[model samples]
Target chain A: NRPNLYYEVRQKPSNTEDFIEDIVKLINGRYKGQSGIIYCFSQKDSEQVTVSLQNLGIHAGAYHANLEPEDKTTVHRKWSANEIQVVVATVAFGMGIDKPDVRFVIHHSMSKSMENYYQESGRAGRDDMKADCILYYGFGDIFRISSMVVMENVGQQKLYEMVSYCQNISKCRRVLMAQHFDEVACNKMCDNCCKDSAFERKNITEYCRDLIKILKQAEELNEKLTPLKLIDSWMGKGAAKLRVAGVVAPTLPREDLEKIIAHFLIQQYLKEDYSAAISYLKIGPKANLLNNEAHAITMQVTK
Target chain B: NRPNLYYEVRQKPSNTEDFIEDIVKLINGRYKGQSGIIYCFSQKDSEQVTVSLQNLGIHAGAYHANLEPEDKTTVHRKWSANEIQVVVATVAFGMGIDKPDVRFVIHHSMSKSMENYYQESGRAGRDDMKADCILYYGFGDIFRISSMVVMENVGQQKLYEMVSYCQNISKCRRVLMAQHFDACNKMCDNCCKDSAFERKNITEYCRDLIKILKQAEELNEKLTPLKLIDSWMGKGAAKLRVAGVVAPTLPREDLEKIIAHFLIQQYLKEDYSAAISYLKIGPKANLLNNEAHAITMQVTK
Candidate 1:
């Protein structure tokens, strides 16, 4: 662990809202007037996020692969000389970025792998005083990135692991990141472990059981439901046009439902089957384990 | 998969006997008067094999790394003009061996990998006429060459794969070789006719091995290879019916090889608990048992 680098992950507000809103707020709040990089996943987003930051009156510049060499150097030089507060750039744009006091490195998008994330986030705190390495993760961003994954085996593994790291709420953020590199975690530096009760360890084994049962029921009928449809069906709604709703729990929110489904897919309790260019869910290898009394599944869920 | 290249393998004789005997008979018989190279695993064997060949009235020359420039060219020049019937040399000695009419290539011991074997044997059949590529295979050579392996992972895997190719009884030699290098290759003599592979189904033996491994875990017994084999072979004081049945059935070498196969395929794994190794059942064992999968390996019959 870098002794001075701190880690934070903020889930995107909603698919309807621009994630740039969160980035703009972050820049104005905790990281105001500091040198930082908002690493976007795409060249388009890099330029686009820079535009958003500039619109908000932050001294931001765009750096990307396709940028003119003159523009590239201009951004590089300007950011180095504190002419701009932040450089919104693609992850690939950091080939030779070695600013010693880069106060923060905010990933406006989840990176492809831990290797990529480690180096990408490492752009922070080069002089080792204190820096923030922030990631904005959303469940939908997982699928958004899935289309761009390289021919699928090696790239799919990396993307999936990245998703796992983002969705993992139980462990220390820095601990999870460090463990990905096979190193030990830091000494109380991450927001998850450093703060006052931001999340709770909640047992959702019964919810997992209900979800599996709903999946198996769909399998029996030779039907595959998307995550939303499955959750709606479990909530005893007519989303799937079925009125069967015995597994409904009023205490479980829709966000928790989606989070549980994502965890289930991650834990292999359910498999996302891609058939005919459409992805749907099915009971997975570890699906039936929830029926066993000894098996308990928990999630680090926010209040 | 050169159309003219043929492959052959002869396991080395017992430790008490001369492996040179097999080489001499091979030179005198199938490859009489043909220009060839007998690639030895070591410099010692290269010189030693040449001496044995000369003693048997076969015109042979020793060529290795230690040989002086004067001797190296003398041997090469002679072999180029048929002054020697064969050049007994180390695999590394072939810096520029592009002799077109070279008729045969025999590996005195297994090379490190298929790349080396294919290239070493590739020296033959350059003239496009039929050339025999012979290899002298031995089970013990697996361990012998293992010591000289570069490091554990790459060297051990390649060495084992070479052994598999040499011991293969089922597949067409050229075709099997082509598959190794990812090609549609080989129609040589080894694949020309029928050399039916002998398939020994070791399903019972494997299950019994797993049973013994499971038993060891239950009793918290640490088993080194010798101790494990002894237990299987009924030397241990504890009574295990499956162990006795499995042990009395096969020779020590066969059982040893079987366990090695298990380790390689990950049916079992090991822990370096102290200075010694102790075996444990791995995840693969569950799949094998669930499917009742029969474990079998092929040996040339």
Candidate 2:
């Protein structure tokens, strides 16, 4: 019998270690004598990871940048022999650590992108057996992550671009991500495509045209515009006056307008010229440019 | 013969002069004589409001905060003539303004709560004619509103409590909201008791239960001992952990040990604290708790 099992461990440390201990206990109970290794992503995370593994009666080693490559290999070999059941490692630790039977990859925090999440999680189910990629996201974690992105040394434009990336909803995230990473993800492998064959893609070109027309009409074309400003410009000064005036008109309602513009940028019709702080309205060559231009003209007059 | 629709004019400013132009265009293109009035929330907002209204070829007015009690009667008398089809008012302007036949109420931002939303929206359907109350929310507006709660230095516990109240899935929202507000909400009508489309209760329950069980199992597997049990319970810790040995693993362990350590205690036990302690069940153990534990041990043995 091929033992019918394998296990690996991962850990991210925070206060409140009780739930961690219970989780280890459960894993140890389920796998019994099966070998597992725990990989900790960071040196700071290793202490808690080891404590967790020890409580479960499963000895796990921590792998991180601090560990020698030889030590890392030893941990890897132990996992291969079914000698180690779980290895706790940081985000940086998992790359190139390929063990085919990893049945679970858990995240204590929401990863920076769904792409990062999908890739990290794809480590499991590689052998085609049923596997789980578990994620636990708390309320503040998302805000903290966004704050970190914003605080990075990158320019404000890059930060805004990243935020925009996080907010996109129209395209299949899997495909958008693969394209970003220079990988040609077949639409078949895209999660959205796989899940919803009839998923309706929003008409992003129409939005881009309106944005362009607004940019053209605005007095100072060269001035940098924030996403919010870009949105208001498309709506025009007339719309803004209506809002300020307390005129109860629902056409181009604030919420719908915000969604439509964000959807356009995410679909990649509008690119942020970070140097300018203004989004350059361009439908990619892949989409219908003429139709988009026509949409812009129609909306400038009507929408 | 259609009634000649009149426009209510707000005091003008140079910047807002062209506001009525667009409405005029729309009305000229669509309905020829359907008249409307634009009301600004304040004198400060009136100039811009008038311009936007004028853009649509509609007239605007500033019925603002400074108006006296009798001024409401004066506004109603203006509407009674059927010359004005719409009245725009500041946030303070609309309450007790009470002219029926107003067909719609649109808001630029989300109201403080659905209660505020329902109350303001209810004003439109007073005549029981076809009326609409549409509200628009902006992307950054929620942040601005949430800041009010934050500025009061509200604690996380209170915020979480509020979230729990709003998200209680077992009860109807109207009943829950009414109970929260201390209003009778019964005879004044427009209750949502049976108005909502009934959701399939069992299927939803099964799906929810399955998801919780799966999370429990995954937490069990990851924590190795039962470290994530509390996280699964959605209390205490905000994150998952692999802290200690809290559960029993399978296949190699005896079926009896499995029952005593994991299965039997989990399925029948009422309190998780008892279940957590009973996870140490084994042959040498002198089981104490109750008939249930003893019976489970005897049956497993």
Candidate 3:
């Protein structure tokens, strides 16, 4: 949402020192009065980060819901006037703020949804000058978010989506974000997509062929299968059981089998039927190539 | 707010017939079951407009602050499901609405500010498809808004700016809106700028406006348009009347036009209630004085 802004995602920090070092690197050469916000997952984390940053001689303050209303106002006024160089706070800090010169917004933890991410990061560069939006993501953040008592399962599902977004290196970050918001096109200016030469589209032609073969074999069994079980059938687990029952077994690594199945799901070569309580991986449109032996027939009849 | 939408402005409609006709022209060929919103200034106006639209055989409902909680919910539910094709609402509606297929948002009256206009009109085209945001502006609306007790001054100033935006015909609408939101370097796709002809130099002509300001000051600071025109043309106590007057020895209309232009450019401020009956030197007058004088000097030379 911060147009003309730079975005970066750090997969996992080794320790707190590494996280602090990253912040220091970002703020070291910047001017003194410029403003930045660091979002933490809780009040305790916010107070700790604020103290840590201040110990390093930065004019920083802590803000969270637990602070007295008077104290929160003081911090908000100081930050608005640029008296405080940075403020580390929980998610409750930024709404209705009128500051326009926020130069950076750093998330020390993952947000609950893409909406939260867009809005929180949108606070920076409201004046339409350049700014930076950086997110520090880790699997631990998912576990932390999932532990909340209310809507725990829904929370976990959203967390998984966020993790998937952070781990997806193949698509443009801006494009993925636009799609998340139901927008059709990206401006092609995000850090990931702008570096077009870095990501090579993986060739999945052979993988698709092998995937169809395995899916055809699974279809003959006429049983609903989980993604893991489908992968196992392609690999040795179910195939070994089938061989014991007088059928041939096809063996592949679990990782490669999972990768192929994932690709098939994405490309609609397979559909996950969630009609029942548990989802079943079922054949899709492109599965016809395997079902009808169309590939073989094409090779024989045309090419 | 809506990137692919077209914007149109209608100067004060003569009567209800004209207003309804304009709306019908917009929605006639559009698909049925597509939703829209029409925002009015008050709950009474919302109900009246809703009844009018419904009378026209459109599926329209009224929403406003005074509605009961259950009624509000029912209207929202019907609108979201496309059971109601249009909702004539006060600003209270559409805040948390998740409907994405709204095809238009018509402002039956002018909005108080660009922010309000942007947000309300933004409800349309949320699905990333094309939509229309139409604003019907009248000076009457400005008076209506300014009469409110709270934030009266701020409300008046914002209304003036909104009117300026509505009357502007030279700049791109998208560019103006983007500038209001503090975005820069927008590629103008608005219809106004896309077909804009090469601008002829109005500077020499605008020098006459500076002469009018000087004359107004010279004549005991009289700011009335007719008074300034009479002084310019050396007419004495003609008792300017709205009708049955001798043709002015000067371009009276042109002089008044330049005065209005200066008002828009902030060289002069109008007393809104007086309907341009009185004007004063605005803040920009001091900064623009030197430039205006230079143009005047060049024209005289």
Which docking category, incorrect, acceptable, medium or high, applies to candidate 3? incorrect
Q: Report, for every candidate in turn, its global Cα lDDT versus the true structure.
A: 0.69, 0.40, 0.61
> Candidate 1 chain A: minimum summed lDDT over ten consecutive residues — where?
A144-153
Candidate 2 vs candidate 3, TM-score winner: 3
Badly placed stretches (over 4 Å) of model 2 are: A1-15, A25-41, A113-115, A140-303, B1-301
Candidate 1 runs further than 4 Å off: A15-18, A150-157, A168-170, A184-187, A198-201, A217-223, A235-238, A242-244, A275-278, A291-294, A301-303, B1-301
TM-score of each: 0.47, 0.27, 0.39
Question: Candidate 3 residues A1-303, lDDT tens each?
Answer: 556666667655748878887787777766445798888765567887888888888888887544554575588788878889888866653334578888888898887667667767777888888888888876445434433311222433455566556656557777768877788633654556655454444445455555455556656766556565665555546544322232233454443344455555545566645311123567767666654533431100101
Q: How far does residue A168 in candidate 1 sit from its true spot (Å)?
A: 4.2
Q: Between candidates 1 and 3, name the one with more favorable lDDT.
A: 1
- The best candidate in terms of lDDT: 1
On TM-score, the candidate that comes out on top is 1
List of clashing residue pairs for candidate 1:
B1-B186, B169-B197
Candidate 2 chain A least-lDDT 10 residues: A1-10
- Stretches of candidate 3 above 4 Å error? A1-303, B147-155, B183-189, B192-194, B198-260, B272-301
Q: lDDT score, residue A169, model 3?
A: 56
